[PDB]
From Swiss-Prot, chains A, B:
Catalysis: reaction(s): TSAVLQ-|-SGFRK-NH2 and SGVTFQ-|-GKFKK the two peptides corresponding to the two self-cleavage sites of the SARS 3C-like proteinase are the two most reactive peptide substrates. The enzyme exhibits a strong preference for substrates containing Gln at P1 position and Leu at P2 position
Residue span relative to the full protein: 3264 to 3568 of 7096
Cytoplasmic side of membrane: 1-305
Glycyl lysine isopeptide (Lys-Gly) (interchain with G-Cter in ubiquitin) crosslink site(s): 5, 90
Active-site residue numbers: 41, 145
Function according to Swiss-Prot or TrEMBL: Cleaves the C-terminus of replicase polyprotein at 11 sites. Recognizes substrates containing the core sequence [ILMVF]-Q-|-[SGACN]. Cleaves and inactivates human TRMT1, preventing tRNA guanine(26)-dimethylation of tRNAs. May cleave human NLRP1 in lung epithelial cells, thereby activating the NLRP1 inflammasome pathway. May cleave human GSDMD, triggering alternative GSDME-mediated epithelial cell death upon activation of the NLRP1 inflammasome, which may enhance the release interleukins 1B, 6, 16 and 18. Also able to bind an ADP-ribose-1''-phosphate (ADRP).
Domain Peptidase C30: 1-305
Domain of life: Viruses
Binding partners and assembly: 3CL-PRO exists as monomer and homodimer. Only the homodimer shows catalytic activity. Interacts with host FBXO22; this interaction promotes the proteasomal degradation of nsp5.
UniProt-reported outcome of changing residue 132 to H: In strain: Omicron/BA.1, Omicron/BA.2, Omicron/BA.2.12.1, Omicron/BA.2.75, Omicron/BA.4, Omicron/BA.5, Omicron/BQ.1.1, Omicron/XBB.1.5, Omicron/EG.5.1
The protein's name: 3C-like proteinase nsp5
């Protein structure tokens, strides 16, 4: 029993983190096979923050301008290329610690582990969700650019996020590992801001199922609701609409607890309308939305890697 | 910016996790140099749960009764010994992945990362505190015995917890790596229960400093308090007493924010007496006590390993 914000073990990703330096700028890179992936912002200088043309900046660089360090071992760059907002540095050494991996672009509402790094050295690991507004609520200081987010499936690392920047509200924006930003953000200094966010309804429902699995039942009631009636209330409280696909995805948890999905929706409706009146759920006085249905199953049933 | 419940990168510990089987019981072990450490409960059977004499149980075993698996590689046990509630299996192979490490017995209020494992395979990582009542609020399923807790300092892993059992309230009890339980618990089936717990005051104060560092200031006020006056209020709300040692430990955060420790104590007093009136701090509607002063500094200043 118990329920924690649980990250994936980070070792397979630790072995891939490197430092990349170009000029005065140093940040983190991801070394997989003989390629290092990092934010293209590394080639920027202090005469460029305002709309730089990265194709011009890159044409003016040569391989010897890139310093890549894996631990105390310098790696020789033998080729360089740009893909969207990521740089690909070909190096002369294949990472012997390369895990089985793939690159995936995730949907809003999905969760992943972040390995926060500084100067190529991992510092900590934590769980994030991709918010509906395509930001993440991370924990990143200066030097964290190029830190990555990932899930692990069996023995395979699915990389889904590379960190680029902090927006004015303190939340974070970045790219998939092919260099495409999540959301409308761009890697240049402009007035961009996070859009209004919404709560991830299917995740709140999953977490209520987690609570039942762990013996928290005070919020249950005898009522049911219709999808349409529930979504009318969701919209009022700035919750994402709940689809039939979400209902089907919650099927396993509904079957394990014997609580129909639309019955749990009526409990959530009551929680939204009345609050918790001083009670907690799984140690939280707020409704938690950064656990997916799969996260609950994995932690309330114990799968490993 | 941002503030997350952040674990240490787990890779150095992943490389030490093994499976140990004796008879019908399988759990996790920790392989360091040529020794595997695991809960002595592994030698128990279904004719023993009620006060077993472990010295008798152990004298009746031989090395070939212990099956140790590291991945798909069986390790040959060449010696076995008991130390308090842990078994030490000498194996014929030194773990080539042994990190720099030490064993430490932590005080209540200190935090650590847990690498939850099943059958020798890591499944997830999360941050725990040792509660004042010497339980932890973990997340563990059947098969998690022998999972370990740890901190990392520079390149050194300080192992501080090995998981043994779940108590009736769903919280968790275990030992240091020398096999001594935290708290009054014993590894046998009896009516033992968690004692009444208390909130870790110095950690709440650290977290309020984290919030200020991150721009949450609504809970501040112009008042100060005396240590004695503050502790009178703490006791009322079942908070641990705050000592001068705690005040000195908060010195760095007090200096970075320019908020005297006893000034923050008066803010906490007001929060205890009046609640949050619908506001949040660092995304929480409760006062968080599982971040130490050192945890705040490391995450709000970015040290790595
Ligand atoms: C880090 O990679 C990065 C990417 C894009 C824009 C910025 C940064 C750091 C500062 N601004
Ligand atoms: C696991 O190691 C362990 C230790 C002590 C007591 C028990 C267990 C699991 C079940 N009871």
């Amino acid at each position: 029993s118990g329920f924690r914000k649980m990250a994936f073990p980070s070792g397979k990703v630790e072995g891939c983190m490197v430092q990349v330096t170009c000029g005065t700028t140093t940040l983190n890179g991801l070394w997989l096979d003989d390629v290092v992936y990092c934010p293209r912002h590394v080639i920027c200088t202090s005469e460029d923050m305002l709309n730089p043309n990265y194709e011009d900046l890159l044409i003016r660089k040569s391989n010897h301008n890139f310093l890549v360090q894996a631990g105390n071992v310098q790696l020789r760059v033998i080729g360089h290329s740009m893909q969207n907002c990521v740089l690909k540095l070909k190096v002369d050494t294949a990472n012997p610690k390369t895990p089985k991996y793939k690159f995936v672009r995730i949907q809003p509402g999905q969760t992943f582990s972040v390995l926060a790094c500084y100067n190529g050295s991992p510092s900590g690991v934590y769980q994030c969700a991709m918010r509906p507004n395509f930001t993440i609520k991370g924990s990143f200081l200066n030097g964290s650019c190029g830190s990555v987010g990932f899930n692990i499936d069996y023995d395979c690392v699915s990389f889904c996020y590379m960190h680029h920047m902090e927006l004015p509200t303190g939340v974070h924006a970045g790219t998939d590992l092919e260099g495409n930003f999540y959301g409308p953000f761009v890697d240049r200094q402009t007035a961009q801001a996070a859009g209004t966010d919404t709560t991830i309804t299917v995740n709140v429902l999953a977490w209520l199922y987690a609570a039942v699995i762990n013996g928290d039942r005070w919020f249950l009631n005898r009522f049911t609701t219709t999808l349409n009636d529930f979504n009318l209330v969701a919209m009022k409280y700035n919750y994402e609409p709940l689809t039939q696909d979400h209902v089907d995805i919650l099927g396993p948890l509904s079957a394990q607890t014997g609580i129909a999905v639309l019955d749990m929706c009526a409990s959530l409706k009551e929680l939204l309308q009345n609050g918790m009146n001083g009670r907690t759920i799984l140690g939280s006085a707020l409704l938690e939305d950064e656990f997916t249905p799969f996260d609950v199953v994995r932690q309330c049933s114990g799968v490993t890697f």
